[PDB]
Amino acid sequence: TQLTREQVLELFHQRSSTRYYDPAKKISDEDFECILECGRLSPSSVGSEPWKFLVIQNKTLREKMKPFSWGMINQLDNCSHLVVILAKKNARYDSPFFVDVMARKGLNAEQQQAALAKYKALQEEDMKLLENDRTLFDWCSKQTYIALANMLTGASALGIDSCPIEGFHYDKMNECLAEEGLFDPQEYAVSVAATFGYRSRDIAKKSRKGLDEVVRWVG
Amino acid sequence: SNAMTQLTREQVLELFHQRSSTRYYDPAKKISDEDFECILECGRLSPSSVGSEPWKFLVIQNKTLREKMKPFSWGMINQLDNCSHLVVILAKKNARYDSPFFVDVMARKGLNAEQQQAALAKYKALQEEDMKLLENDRTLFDWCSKQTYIALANMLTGASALGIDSCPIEGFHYDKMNECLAEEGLFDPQEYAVSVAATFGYRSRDIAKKSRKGLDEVVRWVG
Numbered sequence: 039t040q041l042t043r044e045q046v047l048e049l050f051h052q053r054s055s056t057r058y059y060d061p062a063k064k065i066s067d068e069d070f071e072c073i074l075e076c077g078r079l080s081p082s083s084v085g086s087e088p089w090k091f092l093v094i095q096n097k098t099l100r101e102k103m104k105p106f107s108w109g110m111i112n113q114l115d116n117c118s119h120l121v122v123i124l125a126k127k128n129a130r131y132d133s134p135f136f137v138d139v140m141a142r143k144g145l146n147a148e149q150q151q152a153a154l155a156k157y158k159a160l161q162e163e164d165m166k167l168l169e170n171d172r173t174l175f176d177w178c179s180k181q182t183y184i185a186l187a188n189m190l191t192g193a194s195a196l197g198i199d200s201c202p203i204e205g206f207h208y209d210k211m212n213e214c215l216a217e218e219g220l221f222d223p224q225e226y227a228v229s230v231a232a233t234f235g236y237r238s239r240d241i242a243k244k245s246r247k248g249l250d251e252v253v254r255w256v257g
Numbered sequence: 258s259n260a261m262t263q264l265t266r267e268q269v270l271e272l273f274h275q276r277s278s279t280r281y282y283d284p285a286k287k288i289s290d291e292d293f294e295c296i297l298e299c300g301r302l303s304p305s306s307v308g309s310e311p312w313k314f315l316v317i318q319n320k321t322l323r324e325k326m327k328p329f330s331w332g333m334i335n336q337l338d339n340c341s342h343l344v345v346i347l348a349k350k351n352a353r354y355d356s357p358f359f360v361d362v363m364a365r366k367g368l369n370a371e372q373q374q375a376a377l378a379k380y381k382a383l384q385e386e387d388m389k390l391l392e393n394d395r396t397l398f399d400w401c402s403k404q405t406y407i408a409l410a411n412m413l414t415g416a417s418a419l420g421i422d423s424c425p426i427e428g429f430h431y432d433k434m435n436e437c438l439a440e441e442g443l444f445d446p447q448e449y450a451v452s453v454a455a456t457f458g459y460r461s462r463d464i465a466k467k468s469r470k471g472l473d474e475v476v477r478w479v480g
């Protein structure tokens with residue numbers, strides 16, 4: 039339940055992005071389901087959970103992605119698990135996507151009319167997401183980076199290495215995966231990827247800006 | 258074991274499951290300076306695309322500034338009175354591969370001149386071709402904004418691990434939030450813009466149990 043400050047900082051300091059995986063070490067089914075749960079339990083704006091997790095274990099599909107996946111060229115051949123996270127397309131307040139969102143919350147008829155009003159104000163005016171489809175997509179995509187973070191941190195807490203991945207051609211990745219029937223490309227598009235496994239070598243800790251530079255205190 | 262505590266599967270899940278979005282804070286319970294520093298470090302230490310760390314954390318403790326945000330901050334109107342700490346995360350505007358921002362990124366990594374040139378080529382391909390972030394100013398800002406949701410996520414989890422309640426916040430008027438904070442002189446409006454906020458403190462009331470889509474619904478296994 040509760041950690042000390044030391045335990046929290048040892049966790050976040052020791053987690054590095056791992057590019058060199060031991061191809062002979064596999065994550066147990068039990069450990070990998072725990073990582074997926076960390077993603078599933080993530081918070082999201084208005085409880086939208088606008089994500090899907092493709093676990094790409096197929097070695098033939100891993101090979102096919104390599105030519106346009108320069109960010110994980112080595113990792114695709116050596117990592118235990120690969121997750122491609124999709125974000126919901128056209129998640130408009132007035133879409134059936136939000137019928138499901140409200141159902142899950144158990145809102146009555148009048149509670150739903152109020153919720154639709156709130157969702158519209160958020161999307162149209164407050165955040166101005168309804169400028170174009172890409173701006174609305176990028177909103178769900180941001181939610182999926184919460185899921186990404188939780189999966190990275192959870193894996194690290196279990197003693198499992200990981201790497202978040204943006205280093206691929208998104209258009210060709212979208213075509214590649216949609217052509218495999220892995221999702222409806224009218225409903226979802228690729229957001230971000232992540233590899234999981236066990237380092238093949240020591241991974242040097244990487245630099246950060248100072249807390250003084252990152253934080254502006256407004257007392 | 259080692260210098261590091263090794264958590265069980267059950268303890269790791271506990272940490273994510275026990276984190277609920279808190280809207281009702283005890284106004285008499287304040288987060289210690291030390292615990293809140295820890296929370297901020299979880300944000301600082303977050304991963305980011307190409308080590309860009311394109312975030313800035315405004316810690317808004319000023320009660321006059323908090324009350325000024327209320328009229329256009331309907332998603333945390335009551336939290337603004339009762340929460341211990343408030344963090345507004347900015348994302349870098351116009352983080353182009355050729356920008357002074359990326360000179361600083363490469364300077365932190367200790368790249369010599371030849372491997373700076375190779376990094377520039379990588380940044381350029383990612384922004385221009387792979388992710389097509391240079392469509393307009395907003396697509397480029399939204400890429401930095403996505404990095405800041407990792408920092409957000411890790412600060413909620415850090416708070417959770419320390420026994421501290423939190424709420425991620427999007428429920429405010431962004432143009433008005435930007436105007437309010439920039440007119441206060443808290444950042445350069447051409448350099449940064451508001452990405453997302455979060456409240457921190459202690460529950461005054463028992464908060465709702467999780468409602469999520471099943472693992473069956475969200476996971477497609479490709480064996």
Ligand SMILES: Cc1cc2nc3c(=O)[nH]c(=O)nc-3n(C[C@H](O)[C@H](O)[C@H](O)COP(=O)(O)O)c2cc1C
Pocket residue numbers: 053054055056057108109110201202203204205206230243244245303304305306307308407
């Ligand atoms: C959204 C995201 C995408 C990333 N994409 C890649 C990638 O494609 N290839 C890679 O080798 N590292 C990738 N990284 C890892 C970052 O380079 C890394 O987080 C950064 O260099 C800081 O190092 P550290 O995470 O080990 O502390 C990515 C990180 C993030 C957050």
Ligand SMILES: Cc1cc2nc3c(=O)[nH]c(=O)nc-3n(C[C@H](O)[C@H](O)[C@H](O)COP(=O)(O)O)c2cc1C
Pocket residue numbers: 080081082083084085184276277278279280332333424425426427428429453467468
């Ligand atoms: C980016 C983001 C913004 C959110 N903004 C608000 C907010 O403005 N007000 C609020 O009460 N909750 C807000 N939430 C909390 C969500 O409603 C909550 O995460 C979701 O309903 C799931 O509930 P849980 O976090 O308690 O599991 C936000 C969540 C996220 C991830």
Ligand SMILES: [Ca+2]
Pocket residue numbers: 044048260261262
């Ligand atoms: Ca220790």
Ligand SMILES: [Cl-]
Pocket residue numbers: 057108109110111112113
């Ligand atoms: Cl690689």
Ligand SMILES: [Cl-]
Pocket residue numbers: 280331332333334335336337
């Ligand atoms: Cl509130």
Ligand SMILES: [K+]
Pocket residue numbers: 125126127128129130174175176177178179
């Ligand atoms: K969307």
Ligand SMILES: [K+]
Pocket residue numbers: 348349350351352353397398399400401
């Ligand atoms: K930017």
